[PDB]
RNA sequence: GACGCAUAAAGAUGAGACGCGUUUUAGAGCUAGAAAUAGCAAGUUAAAAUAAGGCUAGUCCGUUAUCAACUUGAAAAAGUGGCACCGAGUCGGUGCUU
DNA sequence: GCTGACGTTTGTACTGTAGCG
DNA sequence: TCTCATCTTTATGCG
DNA sequence: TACAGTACAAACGTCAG
């Protein structure tokens, strides 16, 4: 009667296996529905459900924010048009209509075809006078004439459309900073108190050297105008009031409280951004762009003359062929400037007079475009200065730009603050803003319509956890003083001490804990036990010596926020006071909640009577982040109604009982537990309601559906035991501590081994090293990874994190794939690894970092990947590590959901009866089981290995449970300790083996029949149970099912493709015919439908009846589902039989002659649908012939298994016979099978390892799913893609229940 | 014998932005030709769109998640498939039983 | 007369190709 | 790619 | 890995003798 279930859950699979108490997998004669003659089927209850992995929300969000940016950009353009509109209608009743109809063709345009001036002649005298937008911008700035509104609009609209980044706080301005005479003002100012630096690469290393060549009064002065100095101590040689000085990031008023800094800092930074002020202008960016254009002009004039006078045969390939990455491909084709440079540098090396061009290419100046990937370095304030200059000229002639100058000034610089979010009116699930009035939001009225404070508080409050114990209560800040006290008293209530006189160790009394906290947790940020035993036990308790226990040599707990508030609020008795504790809690809550200084000031204003303004100025810089696991109500709001204390009171003092948070909230004697359990629907609603990524919701829901379907199979009786394989681990304590070493020590060891003084120049703390940019800065020893340039620790936003292998090629967000680099160097390696030249020029420095172990060997391999520079689809053959985290999350959730679904009956004696015992095995047990008794696992043959893992999980779990029911609490849900646990869980499996072998060669014979002790019952018969599991491993029928999935997402490929007279292009906008305008291509089919209809066919048209697949794209899907028959008639189908329309999602399964199966991948592609049931002997041979020298066993055990391969050399040929018979049966790639046979015969003499480690690849020919390329040694086999779908229209369609047990089979031959 | 403390790795969710890129159009091509084009000149920029679109019309929403088939149902949701044994190349046979 | 010659006029294999920092 | 914020899982140390 | 670009092979009229 009884049965059990095993589950193996992966990112793309769940394996499931019902087992009997005998460890046999059962089978039933299942009824099958549908029109076919077949009425019942024999099926084993072992299988695997296969589904494609769920996508994370990343791509959808990166499209959503882009959609918002384009909407807002067009609205900026519209407010500009609104200001310009009554005036533009004077000079041009249709200019905005012409910029709008710019995209259309000449006869589609209602107005004359030239966008800006309309007429041809003025549009060309225009482009002759101003060849780009920047000659326009410059002429507008430096000249003082009355100028054309249509061109003001274009200059402003261009700057408003492409406005540059906002990563610089406040503003830069050129007008205070154009002229290098500021050093005279600086020395004149210090007496009250060229390009000399900038001619070389900017860092302190050059700046000090130059100024000493030209103590403190010059260089130490000027760095405070130029650099974010590292010491926190006060300055020297300084003003009459003495404090620290640096060019601080957010607010230089934090340093001025000790003008020329603004002038000189803007001058140096703008002259670092722009190669300007060797010439005097008022429009520096436009001047630089015009200099680029003129240099490009003279360079091309030189270049073509050189090419014609020395290599005239070469010209067309460079300058006309737009496919070659020549200049034609650089301009008219798709080539970048890197591709053009590597194209053109060999040609320049052999010509004469090219030295200047070769010099310019090495600086990246050679024939630059004006708009490039590195324009993301340009801040918006430069554009802001140009727009201000423009308006300040024109206002003398345009009264209306005088009247509303600041509205246009507002429109470019307005950015929605990130804490406010999308400006909805209630219908956006992403919106959290609250608006004061129902008025429409503009950049001008934004401050009076939107309540920024409430929205900014709600921004955090929507995201921070509810307390897991009190789900209606939001958690504390991490740094809240209540949480500090909670943490220290939670830790210190459980430490124990003993002296020479005492019989046994004793807890700290409440007096002692209070004394320790006030003594040293309030006078040291982190306390060592050395500090505890000296400063408390030796100094207060006067002990000669003491042993302390319950804590490592450094305490985990801290009162660091007390130290902060003590440095700020000077009255220590204020911080130790009871009355003001709520106010201090509000201060730290605000200071965690808000980072914008104005709302910090506006929130803290209510307490300005308790502290001075100097303290308040100190409080508003003390930014905090992070939130505790617990709510205020939990830790000090609720009281046990019998005793009267809160949790924090108990942690402060609990007599000698000294309970911590756990034993408190689990003691029935304290009504905390009653408060918890009174503070504490369908499957799909529950699965939607969980937190975390949407990606994991797929694998959880499908396996819960699988388990419920299995329960439906077994007469609605529940299983005794459910075994879930967990992606969980045990380690030795030394390995696990090494696996989690503090990341400061990683830096210190490597820096000491390479011997640099960077930590003397830039000291840093492990709390600070949690920042990703800063961690990378120290890992790289202060230098860029792509040019030999000293990085700046203050400017780490203009440096950016390159992913060494790009995310578009491979998802890898690890430190081994991250590089901090200058933004231009990162964006100059779009979709690639670093180039060959950069590997050649820096492989030595990378080797110095590798030898010093700041980078891994994997990181060195990714950096030097151009030495192996494939980046092919065949290089994907290692798992992305995201699949492990998803597996862990899914299996963790499914444990608690299946426990909640199975064990539902509450009881008053004990709370919940285990009707079903849900089990969560770590994978090491099943892995050791597989490797000990030669039940090996090869992932490349076929998909049955998922079901075999579930079978072995159920077998091993039930065997361990029935062998050790005393050890039920180690598996059922609800030298170092870790090393002892690791050896215990290693040795717990010894009951499966007949012999136990010691390291000295001793052997112990174990019984052939295993039993438990406490009831003597048989569990593991090493005679017949191993034979039984070997029988179940050799079944040829396993219910593999691929989930039928309607596709969602992008309508097409994203690339927009040029116009052509082909009807397959997707119309990219409703009125834009793609024969004229181009459009998208590669559409994605949501599902096929089987259509049966007439069609008008033949050159003399006549109705022919037809049955075929129609691929409903995602775009057209809703129109189809509104009303099918008119959609089919629009597609051209006539007399359609409505009831015979069959919906066919992706991977709809069909079966054909000789057992052949095909999965419908679209209306015009199939996929191979059968699975090779290869016998176990050849599988274990393939695993042992693979892995041949790298087996983990002893040399004797390696040898005997390596000989097992040699004993079965003839297995190689019979595997090829197996693959031939199968491929002929199901795959039908006869040319590929002949190529496979011929290549095999080409290499039948090569080593049996290399043969097997390539026969393992031939199963790509046979394996289920999409045809994919594979290779056998040198020979590469191209995929035999099943682009024909003609056959499935008369196959039998198989609709599979989610396990694959029940079926509906439709014989489509009878349909038509 | 699943929880908050410290550490670390790998990931995730949301907001605000930047740079590109593509597409069509605009930037008069010229000269020589029966010619298809060839020589030569040119090129660097801009507008518009950037999922088709949608109705609550917002400076909002539109690529995540949910889906075998069939009977009920607006949908949520509920419902629908005998067992034992001997065998095994993707499931077969045998016997009870409804 | 009526088999087949000779174009047009559709229907099948093979290589490319895909938004990204 | 940037800025800002929050959160999950797993592993080790202390209860 | 599904579809796109595109080089390649059967089928369907009017001549052709
Ligand atoms: Mg597994
Ligand atoms: Mg999806
Ligand atoms: Mg990059
Ligand atoms: Mg698996
Ligand atoms: Mg721990």
Give A1089's strand partners.
A1110, A1143
Task: Check if the beta carbon of residue A27 is closer than 8 Å to that of residue A35.
Answer: no
| HEC profile of A77-97 | HHHHHHHHHHHHHHHCCCHHH
CA of A309 to C1' of B27 (A): 30
Between the CA of A698 and the C1' of B66, what is the distance in angstroms? 9
- Distance (Å, whole) CA A560 – CA A480: 10
CA A251 to chain centre: 32
**Two structure tokens written together for A816:** 């081994």
3-state helix, strand, coil in chain A (%, to 5): 45, 15, 40
Q: How far is CA A493 from CA A533, A562, A668, A1107, in A?
A: 16, 20, 20, 78
Query: Long-range pairs for A944-948 at CB < 8 Å and ≥24 separation?
Result: A944/A48, A944/A1038, A944/A1040, A944/A1171, A944/A1173, A946/A8, A946/A10, A946/A13, A946/A14, A946/A15, A946/A48, A946/A50, A947/A15, A947/A16, A947/A17, A947/A46, A947/A47, A947/A48, A947/A1038, A947/A1039, A947/A1040, A948/A15, A948/A1033
Query: Quick one: which of A765, A801, A766, A794 has its CA closest to A780?
Result: A801
Residues 488-527 of A with CB under 7 A from strand D: 491, 494
How far apart are alpha carbons A60 and A66 in whole angstroms? 10
d(CA A1047, CA A1160): 13
Distance CA(A320)–CA(A328), nearest Å, equals 5
Nearest 10 degrees: CA dihedral of A484, A488, A491, A497? 180
**CA separation for the pair A347, A360 (Å, rounded):** 15
**Helical segments of A594-624, H only:** 597-604, 613-619
Q: Calculate the alpha carbon distances from A714 to A16, A646, A710, A718, A1296 in Å.
A: 14, 51, 6, 8, 18
Any strand B atom closer than 7 Å to A735 CB: no
**Residues with CB in 5 Å of ion ligand 3:** A 802, 826
Q: Which nucleotides of E are covered by protein (CB under 7 A)?
A: 1-5, 12-13
Residues 401-430 of chain A in contact with strand B via CB under 7 angstroms: 411, 414-425, 427-430
What is the C-alpha to C-alpha distance for residues A947 and A927, in angstroms, rounded to an integer?
Answer: 15
Which run of H or of E encompasses A995?
A: strand A995-997
> Which nucleotide is nearest to A1050 if distance is taken from CA to C1'?
B63
Q: How far apart are the first and last CA of chain A?
A: 47
Question: For residue A18, which of A1284, A992, A1038 has the smallest C-alpha distance?
Answer: A1038
Angle between helices A977-987 and A923-932 in degrees, nearest 10: 40
Q: How many Cβ atoms from other residues are within 10 Å of residue A496's Cβ?
A: 15
- Cα of A662 from ligand 5 centre, angstroms: 15
Cβ-proximal residues to A332 (8 Å cutoff; 6+ apart), any chain = A322
Taking the centre of ligand 5 as the mean of its atom positions, its distance from the CA of residue A979, in whole angstroms, is 14
User: Which residue among the candidates A380, A383, A479, A803 is catalytic per the annotation?
Assistant: A803
Q: Torsions phi, psi of A100, nearest 5? A: -75, -45
Q: Residue A1018: in which H helix or E strand, if any?
A: strand A1018-1021
CB A1047 within 8 A of CB A1085: yes
> Rounded to whole angstroms, how far apart are CA atoms A721 and A917?
5
Residue with tokens 């000698």: A656
C1' (B62) to CA (A1053) span, angstroms: 17
Q: For residue A839, what is the enclosing H or E element?
A: helix A836-851
Output the CA A700–ligand 4 centroid distance in Å. 14
Residue linked to tokens 């436009």: A286
d(CA A707, CA A701): 10
Q: Which residues pair with A1009 in a beta bridge?
A: A1021
Pairing, β A547-549 against β A496-498: antiparallel
CB atoms within 10 A of CB A991: 19
Name the method of structure determination: cryo-EM
Distance CA A899, CA A707 (A): 12
DSSP string across A1146-1209? BTEEEE-GGG-EEEEEETTEEEE-------HHHHHHHHHHTTTT--SS-HHHHHHHHHHHHTTT
Region of residue A1257 (phi > 0: left; psi between -120 and 50: alpha; otherwise: beta):
alpha
- Give the integer Cα–Cα distance in Å for A1244 and A1222: 21
Q: Check if the beta carbon of residue A419 is closer than 8 Å to that of residue A412.
A: no
Is the Cβ–Cβ distance between A725 and A946 less than 8 Å?
no
Sign of CA dihedral A853, A858, A861, A862: negative
> Are A224 and A261 spatial neighbours (Cβ–Cβ below 8 Å)?
yes
A729 touches strand D (CB under 7 A): yes
A1243 annotated as a binding-site residue: yes
Residue A878 CA: distances (Å) to CA of A15, A941, A945, A1061, A1240: 22, 17, 18, 43, 26
CA distance A1291 to A1282: 15
Q: Closest nucleotide (CA of A1278 to C1')?
A: C14
- For A840-857, the DSSP string reads HHHHHHHHHHHHTTSS-H
Does the CA dihedral A278-A282-A286-A290 come out positive or negative? Answer: negative
Residue A1274 makes CB contacts below 8 A (sequence gap 6+) with A1239
Spatial distance between the Cα atoms of A961 and A942, rounded to a whole number of angstroms: 31
Residue A737 belongs to what H/E stretch? helix A733-738
In b/e form, how buried is each residue of A911-934, taking b as 16+ CB within 10 angstroms?
eeebebbbbbbebebbeebbeeee
Distance A1268 CA to ligand 5 centre (A): 45
| Contact present, A508 and A493 (Cβ < 8 Å) | yes
Structure tokens at A123: 């549009």
For chain A, helix (H) and strand (E) counts, in that order, are 54, 31
Q: How far apart are CA A814 and CA A880, in angstroms?
A: 10
Contacts of A116 (CB under 8 A, 6+ apart): A95, A98, A99, A123, A126, A150, A151, A154
User: CA-CA distances (angstroms) from residue A1070 to A98, A1050, A1081?
Assistant: 19, 18, 15
Which residues lie across from A114 on neighbouring strands? A118
| DSSP string for A153-202 | HHHHHHHHHS--B--S-S---STTTS-TTHHHHHHHHHHH---TTTTS--
A440's CB contacts (< 8 A; 6+ apart) are: none
A1159/C12 CA-to-C1' distance in Å = 21
Q: Closest Cα partner for A263 from A186, A331, A176?
A: A176
Q: How many CB atoms lie within 10 A of CB A1283?
A: 10
Tokens of A368: 């630059």
Find, among A809, A808, A770, A802, the residue nearest to A787 by Cα. Answer: A802
Residue of A1006, A988, A843 lying closest to A929 (CA atoms): A988
C-alpha distances in Å from residue A954, one per residue of A21, A855, A1295: 10, 42, 28
Comparing every residue's Cα with the C1' atom of nucleotide C20, the nearest one is A830
Among all bound ligands, the one having the nearest atom to the CA of A977 is 5
Which phi and psi (to 5°) does residue A1271 adopt?
Answer: -135, 145
Strand D–CB A982 distance below 7 A: yes
Distance (Å, whole) CA A1208 – CA A1179 = 12
A1257 is in an annotated binding site: no
Residues 6+ apart with CB under 8 A from A109: A98, A101
CA distances in angstroms from A916 to A21, A681, A683, A717, A1164, listed in the order given: 14, 22, 19, 11, 47
As ranges, strand C nucleotides with an atom below 7 A of a protein CB are 12-15, 18-21
**Preceding residues of all breaks in chain A (C to N beyond 2.5 angstroms)?**
193, 214, 258, 680, 974
The response to whether A581 counts as a known ligand-binding position is no
Residues A1244 and A716: their CA atoms lie apart, in Å, by: 54
Give the ligand at the shortest distance from the Cα of A828.
3
User: Which residue blocks in A1175-1298 are alpha helix, DSSP H?
Assistant: 1176-1185, 1195-1206, 1211-1222, 1230-1243, 1248-1262
SS3 of A442-511: the string is: CCCCHHHHECHHHHHHHHHHCCCCECCCCCCCEEEECCCHHHHHHHHHHHHCCCEEECCCCCCCEECCHH
Q: Which residue is nearest to nucleotide D4 (CA to C1')?
A: A418
> Do A322 and A333 contact (CB within 8 A), yes or no?
yes
Tell me the C-alpha distance between A1284 and A1307, whole Å.
19
Cα–Cα–Cα angle for A1259, A1263, A1267, nearest 5°?
100
Q: How far is Cα A778 from Cα A764, in angstroms, rounded to an integer?
A: 9
Among A606, A594, A589, which Cα is nearest to A454's? Answer: A594
Backbone φ, ψ for residue A818 (5° rounding)? -110, 140
**CA A743 to the chain's CA centroid:** 21
A1231 touches strand C (CB under 7 A): yes
Q: Residue A1040: which nucleotide is closest by CA–C1'?
A: B90
Antiparallel, parallel or unpaired: β A1085-1097 and A1142-1145:
antiparallel
Q: A802: Cβ under 7 Å from strand C?
A: yes
SS3 label, residue A921: strand
Q: Which residue is nearest to nucleotide E3 (CA to C1')?
A: A1082
Does any strand D atom come closer than 7 Å to the Cβ of A808? no
Report whether A28 contacts A9 (CB < 8 A): no
CA dihedral A686→A687→A693→A694, nearest 10 degrees, is -130
- Going by C-beta distance under 8 Å and a sequence separation of 6 or more, which residues neighbour residue A949? A8, A15, A725, A926, A937
Burial class (CB in 10 A: 0-12, 13-18, 19+), A218: middle
> Nearest nucleotide to A442 by CA–C1' distance?
B59
Q: Work out the number of other CB atoms within 10 angstroms of the CB of residue A363.
A: 7
Give the Cα separation of A1257 and A1237 in Å (integer): 13
Q: Is the dihedral of CA A392, A395, A401, A404 positive or negative?
A: positive
Give the CA-to-C1' distance from A421 to D4 in angstroms. Answer: 12
Q: How many other β-carbons are positioned within 10 Å of the β-carbon of residue A1165?
A: 18
Cβ-count burial of A636 within 10 angstroms (0-12 exposed, 13-18 middle, 19+ buried)?
A: buried
Q: What is the DSSP letter of A1223?
A: I
Whether residue A803 lies in the annotated active site: yes
Please give residues of chain A from 869 to 908 whose alpha-adjacent beta carbon (CB) lies under 7 Å from any atom of strand B.
Answer: 880-882, 884-886, 892, 895
């Amino acid at each position: 009667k009884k049965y059990s279930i095993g589950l193996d859950i992966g990112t793309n699979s769940v394996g499931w296996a019902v087992i009997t108490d005998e460890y046999k997998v059962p089978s039933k004669k299942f009824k099958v529905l549908g029109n076919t003659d077949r009425h019942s089927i024999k099926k084993n209850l072992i299988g695997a459900l296969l589904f494609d992995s769920g996508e994370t929300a990343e791509r959808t969000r990166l499209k959503r924010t882009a959609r918002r940016r384009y909407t807002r950009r067009k609205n900026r353009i519209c407010y500009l048009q609104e200001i310009f509109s009554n005036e533009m209608a004077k000079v041009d009743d249709s200019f905005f209509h012409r910029l709008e109809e710019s995209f259309l063709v000449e006869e589609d345009k209602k107005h004359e075809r030239h966008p800006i001036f309309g007429n041809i002649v003025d549009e060309v005298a225009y482009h002759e006078k101003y060849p780009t937008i920047y000659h326009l911008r410059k002429k507008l700035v430096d000249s003082t004439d009355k100028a054309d509104l249509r061109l003001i609009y274009l200059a402003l609209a261009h700057m408003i459309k492409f406005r540059g980044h906002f990563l610089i706080e406040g503003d830069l301005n050129p007008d205070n900073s154009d002229v290098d005479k500021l050093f005279i003002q600086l020395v004149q100012t210090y007496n009250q108190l060229a390009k000399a630096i900038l001619s070389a690469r900017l860092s302190k290393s050059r700046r000090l050297e130059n100024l000493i060549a030209q103590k403190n009064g010059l260089f130490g002065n000027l760095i405070a105008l130029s650099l974010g100095l590292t010491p926190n101590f006060k300055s020297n040689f300084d003003l009459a009031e003495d404090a620290k000085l640096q060019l601080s990031k957010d607010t230089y008023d934090d340093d001025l409280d000790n003008l020329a800094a603004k002038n000189l800092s803007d001058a140096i930074l703008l002259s670092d951004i722009l190669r300007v002020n060797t010439e005097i202008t008022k429009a520096p960016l436009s001047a630089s762009m015009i200099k680029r254009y003129d240099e490009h002009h003279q360079d091309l004039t030189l270049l073509k003359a050189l090419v014609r006078q020395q290599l005239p045969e070469k010209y067309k390939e460079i300058f006309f062929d737009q496919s070659k990455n020549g200049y034609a491909g650089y301009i008219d084709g798709g080539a970048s400037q890197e591709e053009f440079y590597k194209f053109i540098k060999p040609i320049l090396e052999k010509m004469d007079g090219t030295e200047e061009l070769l010099v310019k290419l090495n600086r990246e100046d050679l024939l630059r475009k004006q708009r490039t990937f590195d324009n993301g370095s340009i801040p918006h304030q430069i554009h802001l200065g140009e727009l201000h200059a423009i308006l300040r000229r024109q206002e003398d002639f345009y009264p209306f730009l005088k009247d509303n100058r600041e509205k246009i000034e507002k429109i470019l610089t307005f950015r929605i603050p990130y804490y406010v979010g999308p400006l909805a009116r209630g219908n956006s699930r992403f919106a959290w803003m609250t608006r004061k009035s129902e008025e429409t939001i503009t950049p001008w009225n934004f401050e009076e319509v939107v309540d920024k404070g409430a929205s900014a508080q709600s921004f955090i409050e929507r995201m921070t956890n509810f307390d897991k114990n009190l789900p209606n209560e939001k958690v504390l800040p991490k740094h809240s003083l209540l949480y500090e006290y909670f943490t220290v008293y939670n830790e210190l209530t459980k430490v124990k001490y003993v002296t020479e006189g005492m019989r046994k160790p004793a807890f700290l009394s409440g007096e002692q804990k209070k004394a320790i906290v006030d003594l040293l947790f309030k006078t040291n940020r982190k306390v060592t036990v050395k500090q505890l035993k000296e400063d408390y036990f030796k100094k207060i308790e006067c002990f000669d010596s003491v042993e302390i226990s319950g804590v490592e040599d450094r305490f985990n707990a801290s009162l660091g926020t007390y130290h902060d508030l003590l440095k700020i609020i000077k009255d220590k008795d204020f911080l130790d006071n009871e009355e003001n504790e709520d106010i201090l809690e509000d201060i730290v809550l605000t200071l965690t909640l808000f980072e914008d200084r104005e709302m910090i000031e506006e929130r803290l204003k209510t307490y300005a009577h308790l502290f001075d303004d100097k303290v308040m100025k100190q409080l508003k810089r003390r930014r905090y982040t992070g939130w505790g696991r617990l709510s205020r109500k939990l830790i000090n709001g609720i009281r046990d109604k019998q005793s009267g204390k809160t949790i924090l009171d108990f942690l402060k003092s609990d007599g000698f009982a000294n309970r911590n948070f756990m034993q408190l909230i689990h003691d029935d004697s304290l009504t905390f537990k009653e408060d918890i359990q009174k503070a504490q629907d369908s499957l799909h609603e529950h699965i939607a309601n969980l937190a975390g990524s949407p990606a994991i919701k797929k694998g959880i829901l499908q396996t819960v559906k699988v388990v419920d379907e299995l329960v439906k199979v077994m007469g609605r009786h529940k299983p005794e035991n459910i075994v879930i394989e967990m992606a969980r681990e045990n380690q030795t304590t030394q390995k696990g501590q090494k696996n989690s070493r503090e990341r400061m020590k990683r830096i210190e060891e490597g820096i000491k081994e390479l011997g640099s003084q960077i930590l003397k120049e830039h000291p840093v703390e492990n709390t600070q090293l949690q920042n990703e940019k800063l961690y990378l800065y120290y890992l790289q020893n202060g230098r860029d990874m792509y040019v030999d340039q000293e990085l700046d620790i203050n400017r780490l936003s203009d440096y950016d994190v390159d992913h060494i292998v790009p995310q578009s090629f491979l998802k890898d967000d690890s430190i081994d794939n991250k590089v901090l680099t200058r933004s231009d160097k990162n964006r100059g390696k779009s979709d690639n690894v670093p180039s060959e030249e950069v590997v050649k020029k820096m492989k030595n420095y990378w080797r110095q970092l590798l030898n010093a172990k700041l980078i891994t060997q994997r990181k060195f391999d990714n950096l030097t990947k151009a030495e192996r520079g494939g980046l092919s689809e065949l290089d994907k053959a290692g798992f992305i590590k995201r699949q492990l985290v998803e597996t862990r999350q899914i299996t963790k959730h499914v444990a608690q959901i299946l426990d909640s679904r199975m064990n539902t009956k509450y009881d008053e004696n004990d709370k919940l009866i285990r009707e079903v015992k849900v089990i969560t095995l770590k994978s090491k047990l099943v892995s050791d089981f597989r490797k000990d008794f030669q039940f090996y696992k090869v992932r490349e043959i076929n998909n049955y290995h998922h079901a075999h893992d579930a079978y072995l999980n159920a077998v091993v779990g039930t065997a361990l449970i029935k062998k050790y029911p005393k050890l039920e609490s180690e598996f059922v849900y609800g030298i170092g300790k870790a090393t002892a646990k690791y050896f215990f869980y290693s040795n717990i499996m010894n009951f499966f083996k007949t012999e136990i072998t010691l390291a000295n060669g001793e052997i112990r014979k174990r019984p052939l029949i295993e039993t438990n002790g406490e009831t003597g019952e048989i569990v593991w018969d090493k005679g017949r149970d191993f034979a039984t599991v070997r029988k179940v491993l050799s079944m040829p029928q396993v219910n593999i099912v691929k989930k039928t999935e309607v596709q969602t997402g992008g309508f097409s490929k994203e690339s927009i493709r040029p116009k052509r007279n082909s009807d397959k292009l997707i119309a990219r906008k409703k009125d834009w015919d793609p024969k004229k305008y181009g459009g998208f291509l590669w559409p994605t089919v949501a599902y096929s439908v089987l259509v049966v209809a007439k069609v008008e066919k033949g050159k003399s048209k006549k109705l022919k009846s037809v049955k075929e697949l129609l691929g409903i794209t995602i775009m057209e899907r809703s129109s189809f589902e509104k009303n099918p028959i008119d959609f089919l008639e629009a597609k051209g189908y006539k007399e359609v039989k409505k009831d015979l329309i069959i919906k066919l999602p992706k991977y709809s399964l069909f079966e054909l002659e000789n057992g052949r199966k095909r999965m419908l991948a679209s209306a015009k592609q199939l996929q191979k649908g059968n699975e090779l049931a290869l016998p176990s002997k050849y599988v274990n041979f393939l695993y042992l012939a693979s892995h041949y020298e790298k087996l983990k066993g002893s040399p004797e055990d390696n040898e005997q298994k390596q000989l097992f391969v040699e004993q079965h050399k003839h297995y190689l040929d019979e595997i090829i016979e197996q693959i031939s018979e199968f491929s002929k049966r199901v795959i039908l790639a006869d040319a590929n099978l002949d190529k496979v046979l011929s290549a095999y015969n080409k290499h039948r003499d090569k080593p049996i390892r290399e043969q097997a480690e390539n026969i393992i690849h031939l199963f790509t020919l046979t394996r289920l799913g999409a045809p994919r390329a594979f290779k056998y040694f040198d020979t590469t086999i191209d995929p035999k893609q099943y682009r024909s779908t003609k056959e499935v229209l008369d196959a039998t369609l198989i609709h599979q229940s989610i396990t694959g047990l029940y079926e509906t089979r439709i014989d489509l031959s009878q349909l038509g």
